[PDB]
């Protein structure tokens, strides 16, 4: 269907994290911890820089609980994620690498 489904930048990031959890083989669900602030140009099909951290929650990676319902684990791993999102979800996708050693 859609050829143009545009998310806000924050939504695009939450959606990418959903993706990142989906492709991962970690036991637990990771959740947005801190999104770095950045200013955009206003075209939805061009990649927007993102960088942010995620932290391990007490939820199983495949939980269907909403991430906001998944408490961060005490002592939880934090990974820093860098790359781009594309606001137009319709096509293309984010390009983000998460790394526990990028601190």
UniProtKB/Swiss-Prot annotation:
Expressed in neutrophilic granulocytes (at protein level). Expressed in bone marrow. Keywords: Antibiotic, Antimicrobial, Cleavage on pair of basic residues, Disulfide bond, Immunity, Innate immunity, Pharmaceutical, Secreted, Signal. Disulfide bonds join 59-70, 81-98. GO terms for cellular component: cell projection; extracellular exosome; extracellular region; extracellular space; specific granule; specific granule lumen; tertiary granule lumen. It is found in: Secreted; Vesicle. The N-terminus is blocked. Its main location: secreted. Residues 5-103 form a propeptide. One of its GO terms (biological process) is innate immune response in mucosa. The propeptide shows high sequence homology to cathelin, a protein of 96 residues isolated from porcine neutrophils, and is therefore also named cathelin-like domain (CLD). Cathelin was initially classified into the cystatin family of cysteine protease inhibitors based on its inhibitory activity against cathepsin L. Human CLD itself lacks antimicrobial function and does not inhibit the cysteine protease, cathepsin L. Belongs to the cathelicidin family. The cathelin-like domain (CLD), which is the propeptide part, does not seem to exhibit auto-inhibitory function, as it does not inhibit the antibacterial activity of antibacterial peptide LL-37. This is Cathelicidin antimicrobial peptide.
